[PDB]
Amino acid sequence: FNGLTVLPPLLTDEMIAQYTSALLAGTITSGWTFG
Amino acid sequence: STASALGKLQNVVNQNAQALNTLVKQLSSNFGAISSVLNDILSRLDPPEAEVQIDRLITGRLQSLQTYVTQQLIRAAEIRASANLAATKMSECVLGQSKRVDFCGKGYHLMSFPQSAPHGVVFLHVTYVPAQEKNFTTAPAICHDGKAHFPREGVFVSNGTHWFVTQRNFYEPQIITTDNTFVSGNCDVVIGIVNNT
Amino acid sequence: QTRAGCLIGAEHVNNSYECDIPIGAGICASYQSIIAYTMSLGAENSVAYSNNSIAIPTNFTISVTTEILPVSMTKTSVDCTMYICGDSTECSNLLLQYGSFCTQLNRALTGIAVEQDKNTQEVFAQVKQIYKT
Amino acid sequence: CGDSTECSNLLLQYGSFCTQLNRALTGIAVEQDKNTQEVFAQVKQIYKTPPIKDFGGFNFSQILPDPSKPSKRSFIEDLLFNKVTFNGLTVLPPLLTDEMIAQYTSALLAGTITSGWTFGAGAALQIPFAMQMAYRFNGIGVTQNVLYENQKLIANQFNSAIGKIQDSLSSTASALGKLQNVVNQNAQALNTLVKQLSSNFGAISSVLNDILSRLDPPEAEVQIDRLITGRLQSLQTYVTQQLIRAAEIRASANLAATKMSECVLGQS
Amino acid sequence: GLTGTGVLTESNKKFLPFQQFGRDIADTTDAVRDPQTLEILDITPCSFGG
Ligand SMILES: *[C@@H]1O[C@H](CO)[C@@H](O[C@@H]2O[C@H](CO)[C@@H](O)[C@H](O)[C@H]2NC(C)=O)[C@H](O)[C@H]1NC(C)=O
Ligand SMILES: *[C@@H]1O[C@H](CO)[C@@H](O[C@@H]2O[C@H](CO)[C@@H](O)[C@H](O)[C@H]2NC(C)=O)[C@H](O)[C@H]1NC(C)=O
Ligand SMILES: *[C@@H]1O[C@H](CO)[C@@H](O[C@@H]2O[C@H](CO)[C@@H](O)[C@H](O)[C@H]2NC(C)=O)[C@H](O)[C@H]1NC(C)=O
Ligand SMILES: *[C@@H]1O[C@H](CO)[C@@H](O[C@@H]2O[C@H](CO)[C@@H](O)[C@H](O)[C@H]2NC(C)=O)[C@H](O)[C@H]1NC(C)=O
Ligand SMILES: *[C@@H]1O[C@H](CO)[C@@H](O[C@@H]2O[C@H](CO)[C@@H](O)[C@H](O)[C@H]2NC(C)=O)[C@H](O)[C@H]1NC(C)=O
Ligand SMILES: *[C@@H]1O[C@H](CO)[C@@H](O[C@@H]2O[C@H](CO)[C@@H](O)[C@H](O)[C@H]2NC(C)=O)[C@H](O)[C@H]1NC(C)=O
Ligand SMILES: *[C@@H]1O[C@H](CO)[C@@H](O[C@@H]2O[C@H](CO)[C@@H](O)[C@H](O)[C@H]2NC(C)=O)[C@H](O)[C@H]1NC(C)=O
Ligand SMILES: *[C@@H]1O[C@H](CO)[C@@H](O)[C@H](O)[C@H]1NC(C)=O
């Protein structure tokens, strides 16, 4: 590379997996009330 | 097993990579000058001509950079539109049950589950689809004792000999009763009323 | 000879199937040799309509389908002067007299990167707490 | 360049510019085809209406396909179609000819007439039209009793309104402003692009042959470069405008697809 | 003195007795009159495509 850089994303994929797990557990256990 | 299913994410990655590749490849063009490297132009001429040669390289590279930036802006706008749609789907079809037809799924929506992907999201939609139909004869109202009866909810059907009321999306006959029907007027202005008890 | 041009190497038939490799003007080709034909929009049926007859389901099925959506792309940045001059003082001095160009070419990219982060955060961060099964 | 070997050789040293332009234009064309196919192809089978038509007094003749004309279009579609009416540039035909589009619309309309909203979810289930109207009244908070006791009046009102629509379209002009605007904008863009091919851009002339047959090649190359840069810039501007317009059209097409899915296959 | 490539066909336009050629729009020549026989010829670009 000749003066071009790639920046890393703020949220690592582990955090995204954690969000998806939280959402899915919530919808399994509490219906739509947690929304 | 099956491949070529995640076409969109691969397409995005390929487009970005190709844009960077052509941008870096552009650094090997004369743009009308004598060479594509600065050192040789510096070492093979005098300043009054070296600057003339350098100016062409400068303007060409600047133009290429501008083109790259504009392409990036357009593609970013499109990606933002897609992300807004994804957020709306996550809010409406995961945290609730949606009534707008075909918004998330093909059928009557029941629920949805999210999953993550390298640069996007995947929705699993769980829907309900009816099957195994059957023909029936119907009528809009029942005339009895000179009065007209309509179903509270459901529909009148007959298997050729007797009449029943059913819910509209699943066959489940029941005997017509004064508890699942209501009355309004006499049986004179309705087109297709039938006689029963 | 077709409305889209001239086609060599394929045989024209009189049937009609689904479209595999679109060609144009309503015709496309497939492999059996290579054949070219007119598209068929789908199967034909005449639903049995009458003014005193209905159809009611007696069973059901449950289906799971997938949808895929992109929400982000890579964040990149460019050092204008290193790309355009690359360790040359004379080039830098010559570039100086083109006014303010480099700041504009960086504000856009920074906006793009911030937008990517905002996109991901808006799509995924929708719960106050972290629930567990 | 236009059949000028010297121009081509001079252009070679400008790197890969026009490859990107061709890529962008091909992307635009593919997107157009996708837009049309995604808006209109929303059914699995080609439904057909029965020969004998007794829809409780409602009259759909103005909208149903007309077998007399070869196009098999309807009255309103014919009115709509009649109401609105080189140097290396080409126009490619669309993938779906308008007969197939008319067939799709006919199939959708026959399905919604005969099977309510059922065909949008699974297999189409027949239902007499008056019962479907009763369901739809019940869906907005009015009991079906009201429909069944006022059938003739409702049918007459619907027939009168559908008759009035045709007069409104036929008499008044400029109703199809948006489609005409799109066509005019595209035509004007092409016209100005091809008009730009007659500018000196500070050179001595605007014809390559005249420059070639008048100057020494070491002097002619400068004029050739001066022409090349201006023509390239004009092409770039045209491509960028096309990209913006295509994005706008795609947004409109997505909205149209949503409307077709929600307001035709169901009650909103 | 007017140069260009293409295919020349017979046409049926009616020039006034003093024009020498014609252009349709965007200033592209479409017809010429031969200086000797004095008849109108039509110009069509040579075919091309991808
Ligand atoms: C329509 O449904 C009714 C209700 O089940 C049927 O009547 C019953 O038929 C069974 C078997 O034929 C008898 O054992 C019952 O005694 C009948 N009930 C009454 C109240 O008569 C009827 O046979 C069905 N008709 C058809 C054509 O399927
Ligand atoms: C539904 O359609 C049938 C058949 O077209 C209609 O039945 C006709 O009714 C009239 C008046 O009662 C009779 O004169 C005809 O002879 C009947 N047709 C046949 C073929 O016998 C019926 O009126 C329609 N409407 C309903 C049932 O509400
Ligand atoms: C439903 O029942 C009523 C009453 O039993 C029928 O009305 C009779 O119709 C006949 C011939 O149309 C007349 O001769 C009688 O005078 C009527 N009686 C009354 C009390 O109005 C009615 O026809 C029946 N419905 C059908 C479809 O047969
Ligand atoms: C329901 O009744 C119809 C009418 O008898 C049955 O037959 C179908 O009728 C339609 C229109 O007349 C035809 O397009 C079909 O091909 C007929 N089906 C055949 C011949 O098998 C129909 O089968 C009955 N059942 C259902 C589920 O529709
Ligand atoms: C509704 O459909 C289901 C699935 O097709 C039927 O369940 C099947 O029943 C047969 C006979 O009892 C079994 O051999 C299959 O193994 C069953 N399938 C499954 C997935 O369990 C069910 O019988 C149908 N219901 C009715 C009333 O027809
Ligand atoms: C539905 O409406 C059309 C009008 O568009 C009716 O067609 C007319 O029919 C009458 C009687 O046959 C003719 O005198 C008119 O010339 C027709 N109009 C046109 C424009 O052709 C049609 O009859 C109506 N359908 C029904 C069942 O009444
Ligand atoms: C140019 O000269 C030629 C040679 O004479 C002319 O051609 C002939 O013109 C006479 C005039 O009546 C005709 O009778 C001959 O048939 C022509 N010969 C041909 C066509 O081979 C030509 O007309 C002259 N061009 C002009 C006067 O504009
Ligand atoms: C079949 O196709 C050929 C050409 O492909 C055509 O000449 C002919 O009319 C078509 N129909 C029959 C019945 O042969």
Bridge partners of C76, per DSSP, are: A6
Q: Which residues from B are below 8 Å from A16, CB to CB?
A: 116
Name the β-bridge partners of B109.
B127
* d(CA D172, nearest CA chain C) in Å: 33
Using CA coordinates, name the residue in chain A closest to C80. Answer: A3
- Residue E23: helix, strand or coil by DSSP? strand
Stretch (H or E) spanning C95: helix C89-96
Question: From the CB of residue E10, how many other CB atoms can be counted at a distance below 10 Å?
Answer: 8
Q: Are B114 and A23 in contact (CB under 8 A)?
A: yes
Partners of B85 on chain C (C-beta within 8 Å) are 69
The C-alpha angle C25, C31, C37, rounded to 5 degrees, equals 30
**Any ligand 4 atom below 6 A from CB of B135:** yes
Three-state SS for D161? Answer: helix
Q: Does residue C51's CB lie within 6 angstroms of at least one atom of ligand 2?
A: yes
Neighbouring chains of D at 3+ CB pairs within 8 Å?
A: B, C, E
Q: Is residue B73 less than 8 Å (CB to CB) from chain D?
A: no
Dig out the tokens for B134 from the structure: 């059957």
- The Cα-based distances of B137 to B170, B189, C108, D115 in angstroms read 16, 21, 67, 15
The ligand minimizing its distance to the Cα of B129 is 5
Residues with CB under 6 A from ligand 7: E 36, 38
**B114 token code pair:** 């999210």
Helical (H) or strand (E) element with D179: helix D177-195
Q: Which ligand is nearest to the CA of E33?
A: 7
Give the angle C28-C32-C38 at the CA atoms, nearest 5°.
25
Three-class SS state of D75: helix
What distance in Å separates the CA atoms of residue E29 and residue E42, rounded to the nearest whole number?
9
Helix (H) or strand (E) holding D186: helix D177-195
With CA atoms as reference, report the closest residue to A32 among D181, B92, C120.
B92
What distance in Å separates residue B127's CA from the closest CA in chain D? 10
Q: Which ligand 2 atom is nearest residue B191's CA?
A: 28
Burial class of residue D73, CB neighbours in 10 A (0-12, 13-18, 19+): buried
Question: Is D216:D1 a contact under the CB 8 Å cutoff?
Answer: no
For helices C104-124 and A13-30, give the axis angle rounded to 10 degrees. 30
Q: Any idea which residue has 């009816």 for tokens?
A: B130
Q: Which ligand is nearest to the CA of E39?
A: 7
- In contact, C119 and C113? CB cutoff 8 Å: no
Q: Which residues of D touch C18 (CB under 8 A)?
A: none
| C-alpha angle E48-D92-D65 in degrees, rounded to nearest 5 | 145
Nearest CB among D88, D195, D209 relative to E26 is that of D195
- Report CA-CA distances (Å) from B142 to B157, B162, C19, C53: 11, 13, 51, 16
Interface test with D, best of B55, B101, B137 (most D CBs within 10 A): B101
Helix (H) or strand (E) holding E22: strand E21-23
Residue D195 φ/ψ, nearest 5 degrees:
-70, -30
Instruction: Name the DSSP letter for residue D120.
Output: G
In 3D space, the residue among A12, A18, B116 whose CA is nearest the CA of residue C131 turns out to be: A18
Nearest to D20 by CA among B23, B152, B129: B23
| Nearest listed ligand to the Cα of residue D125 | 4
Do residues B29 and D14 touch, judged by C-beta distance below 8 A? Answer: yes
Question: Are the CB atoms for E50 and D22 separated by under 8 Å?
Answer: no
Residue with tokens 């099925």: C61
Q: Which parts of B3-107 fold into alpha helices (H)?
A: 7-25, 38-43, 47-93
Q: How far is the CA of C60 from the centre of ligand 5 (A)?
A: 10
Q: Write out the two tokens for B133.
A: 């139909």
Is residue B153 within 8 Å of B144, Cβ to Cβ?
no
In the reported structure, the alpha carbon of residue D62 is separated from the centroid of ligand 6 by a whole-number distance in angstroms of 9
Three-state DSSP at B61 gives: helix
Which residues of chain A make contact with B111, given a CB cutoff of 8 A?
Answer: 27
Which run of H or E residues covers position D168? helix D151-171
The partner residues of B164 in beta bridges, in order of sequence, read: B157
Question: How far, in Å, CA of B160 to CA of B173, rounded?
Answer: 13
Which residue is associated with the tokens 């501008």? B66
Interface of C with B in 96-115 (CB under 8 A): 98, 101, 105, 108-109, 112, 115
Q: Tell me the C-alpha distance between B48 and B41, whole Å.
A: 12
Distance CA D66, CA D72 (A): 5
Which ligand 8 atom sits closest to the C-alpha of C12? 5
The contacts of residue A16 (CB under 8 Å, 6+ apart) are B116, C120, C124
CA separation for the pair B122, B40 (Å, rounded): 54
Q: Ligand 6 centroid to C49 CA: how many Å?
A: 22
> Which residues pair with residue C35 across a beta bridge?
C11, C30
- Please tell me the distance from the alpha carbon of residue D207 to that of residue D198, in angstroms, as a whole number: 8
CA dist., res. B197 & res. C14, Å (int)? 60
Q: Provide residues of C within 8 Å CB-CB of chain A.
A: 72, 74-83, 86, 113, 116-117, 120-121, 124-127, 129-133
Residues of D in contact with E49 (CB under 8 A): 90
- Residue A7 carries which side chain, given as an amino acid letter? L
Ligand 3 centroid distance, CA of B146 (Å): 10
Helix ranges, D196-268 (H):
208-212, 217-263
List CB contacts (< 8 A) between B42 and chain C. Answer: 88, 90
Resolution, Å (one decimal): 2.7
For residue E24, what are its two tokens?
Answer: 């349709």
**Residue E24 sits at the chain D interface (C-beta within 8 Å):** no
Could you tell which of E37, E38, E39 is best to mutate to test the pocket of ligand 7, judged by most ligand atoms within 8 Å of the CB? E37
Dihedral pair phi/psi, residue D206, rounded to 5°: -130, 15
- The one-character DSSP state at C127 is -
Ligand nearest to the CA of C50: 2
Query: Which residue matches tokens 């299913």?
Result: B5
Question: Which contacts of C24-31 are long-range, i.e. CB under 8 A and separated by 24 or more positions?
Answer: C24/D92, C24/D93, C24/D94, C24/D95, C25/D93, C25/D95, C25/D97, C26/D95, C26/D96, C26/D97, C26/D99, C26/D100, C27/C2, C27/C3
Cα-based distances in Å from B3 to A31, B7, B64, D6, E25: 34, 9, 36, 48, 52
Q: What are the percentages of helix, strand and coil residues in chain B, rounded to 5?
A: 35, 25, 40
Instruction: Point out which residues pair with B125 in neighbouring strands.
Output: B112, C65
Structure tokens at E27: 């200033």
Token pair listed for B177: 């009763």
Question: Which of A3, A7, A28 is nearest residue C75 as measured by Cβ atoms?
Answer: A7
Both tokens of B189, joined, read: 């202005």
Query: 């005409």: which residue's tokens?
Result: D180
- H/E stretch holding D144 reads helix D144-148
Q: Residue D79 contacts by C-beta under 8 Å, 6 or more apart in sequence? A: D166, D169, D170
B129 three-class SS: strand
From the CB of C62, is ligand 4 less than 6 Å away?
Answer: no
Q: Between the CA atoms of D23, D28, D29 and D35, what dihedral angle is there, to the nearest 10 degrees?
A: 150
Please choose, from the candidates B166, B156, B169, the residue with its C-alpha nearest in 3D space to the C-alpha of residue B195.
B156
Method: cryo-EM
Q: Pocket of ligand 7, candidates E20, E33, E34, E36: which has the most ligand atoms within 8 Å of its Cβ, to mutate?
A: E36
CA distance B85 to chain C (A): 9
Nearest CA in chain D to E5: D3
Please tell me which residue of chain C has the smallest CA distance to B60. C84
Out of D3, D90, D194, whose CB is closest to E26? Answer: D194
For the beta sheet containing B155-158, the strands, ordered from the edge strand earlier in sequence to the opposite edge, are B163-166, B155-158, B135-138, C53-55
Ligand 6 site-directed mutation target among D55, D60, D61, D170, most atoms within 8 Å of CB: D61
Closest Cα to residue C47, out of B66, D119, D47, D103?
D47
Determine the distance separating the centroid of ligand 7 and the alpha carbon of E36, expressed in angstroms.
8
User: Whose structure tokens read 């001509």?
Assistant: B49
Environment class of C74 (CB within 10 Å of its CB; exposed 0-12, middle 13-18, buried 19+): middle
Q: Atom 9 in ligand 8: which residue has the minimum CA distance?
A: C14
Contact D100, C39 (CB under 8 A): yes
